[PDB]
Design a protein around this ligand. Structure first.
Ligand SMILES: CCCCCCCC/C=C\CCCCCCCC(=O)OC[C@H](O)CO
Ligand SMILES: CCCCCCCC/C=C\CCCCCCCC(=O)OC[C@H](O)CO
Ligand SMILES: CCCCCCCC/C=C\CCCCCCCC(=O)OC[C@H](O)CO
Ligand SMILES: CCCCCCCC/C=C\CCCCCCCC(=O)O
Ligand SMILES: CCCCCCCCCCCCCCCCCCCC
Ligand SMILES: CCCCCCCCCCCCCCCCCCCC
Ligand SMILES: CCCCCCCCCCCCCCCCCCCC
Ligand SMILES: CCCCCCCCCCCCCCCCCCCC
Ligand SMILES: CCCCCCCCCCCCCCCCCCCC
Ligand SMILES: CCCCCCCCCCCCCCCCCCCC
Ligand SMILES: CCCCCCCCCCCCCCCCCCCC
Ligand SMILES: CCCCCCCCCCCCCCCCCCCC
Length: 230
């Protein structure tokens, strides 16, 4: 409670934990193999986020990085979370549209580059270089978003209508929410430092819960997750 952002870390921990438990209960008894994949991916996402939020709350997921002549508090645990949860979210989208394996690898690999370069930027001691890493990570994000909109055209003709509808919604949620992350980083403690760490933490908490629990609620309520069966 000594760090003013503790309240948002505590709320994030609680919301990710509750979301995990809800998805776990909802997925009980699901037998359809396709739906099992979606439940597994979508429950793992907030479970991982729960552990990383808790690590930030307890202080383990925080380090001090010297730059700008100050000791800057950097929550590195965010990147450990996103390293696993962001490819999983992309996998949900890719499986919906029956994406080719090559497209899945492109997405997951670009996503790993996005998170890894974000982490390097977050830990870099030379202030100006932090924004070089931010730019590379943002380029990887833009590549991901491009694929989401322009890499699935060969699947549109044979796509079930409910699949197309649910994918379209989830893709729009993804573009809007994922785009905000580089902005928050750029203006917050890890970038220009014009927004204080406590407000940055609040912003990431709202984004994370929306991108994980909100996204999951939309997906797991849809008929698109079930194979076409009589
Ligand atoms: C916007 C961000 C959504 C955040 C949700 C956190 C709440 C945790 C999960 C609560 C979900 C409860 C729910 O929606 O259950 C409805 C359904 O009808 C019963 O099976
Ligand atoms: C996922 C859990 C990541 C653990 C990595 C770790 O603990 O190492 C970081 C270092 O010890 C702390 O600065
Ligand atoms: C001047 C620096 C230039 C280098 C900047 C690199 C840094 C990372 C930037 C963007 C991510 C690149 C993602 C690479 C993954 C592309 C995979 C691919 O090409 O997939 C095509 C295939 O047909 C399947 O759809
Ligand atoms: C496209 C590029 C968008 C903006 C990129 C870089 C912004 C760099 C901001 C540097 C901060 C300097 C001021 C400060 O120290 O607070
Ligand atoms: C320092 C203040 C501690 C009390 C905050 C309690 C907030 C819990 C409910 C938050 C509402 C979010 C629900 C979505
Ligand atoms: C100090 C608050 C700790 C976060 C709540 C723990 C998660 C509860 C999920 C059920
Ligand atoms: C506590 C950190 C947990 C991260 C491990 C998550 C591994 C995910 C494996 C499937 C992707
Ligand atoms: C200054 C040192 C700060 C430590 C940063 C460590 C960040 C590691 C995040 C990557 C996650 C790797 C997960 C390994 C499996 C567990
Ligand atoms: C780089 C780490 C990749 C984590 C993979 C998470 C599983 C989703 C893709 C299979
Ligand atoms: C202090 C200004 C540093 C900003 C460099 C950002 C690099 C953008 C892409 C090259
Ligand atoms: C049909 C597509 C649904 C629109 C998705 C709304 C995105 C809002 C994200 C915040
Ligand atoms: C001292 C004023 C600093 C606050 C800048 C807020 C920038 C928000 C725009 C995104």
């Amino acid at each position: 409670t000594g760090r003013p952002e503790w309240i948002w870390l505590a709320l994030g921990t609680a919301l990710m934990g509750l979301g995990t438990l809800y998805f776990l209960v909802k997925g009980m008894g699901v037998s359809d193999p396709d739906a099992k994949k979606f439940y597994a991916i979508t429950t793992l996402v907030p479970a991982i986020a729960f552990t990383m939020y808790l690590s930030m709350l307890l202080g383990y997921g925080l380090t001090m990085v010297p730059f700008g002549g100050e000791q800057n508090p950097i929550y590195w645990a965010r990147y450990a979370d996103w390293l696993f949860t962001t490819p999983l979210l992309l996998l949900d989208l890719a499986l919906l549209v029956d994406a080719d394996q090559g497209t899945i690898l492109a997405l997951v690999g670009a996503d790993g580059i996005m998170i890894g370069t974000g982490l390097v930027g977050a830990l870099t001691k030379v202030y100006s270089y932090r924004f070089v890493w931010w730019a590379i990570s943002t380029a990887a994000m833009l590549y991901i978003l491009y694929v989401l909109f322009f890499g699935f055209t060969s699947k549109a003709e044979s796509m079930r209508p409910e699949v197309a509808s649910t994918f379209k919604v989830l893709r729009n949620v993804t573009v809007v929410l994922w785009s905000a992350y580089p902005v928050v980083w750029l203006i917050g403690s890890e970038g220009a430092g014009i927004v204080p760490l406590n407000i940055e933490t609040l912003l990431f908490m709202v984004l994370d819960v929306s991108a994980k629990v909100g996204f999951g609620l939309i997906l797991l309520r849809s008929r698109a997750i079930f194979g076409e069966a009589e």
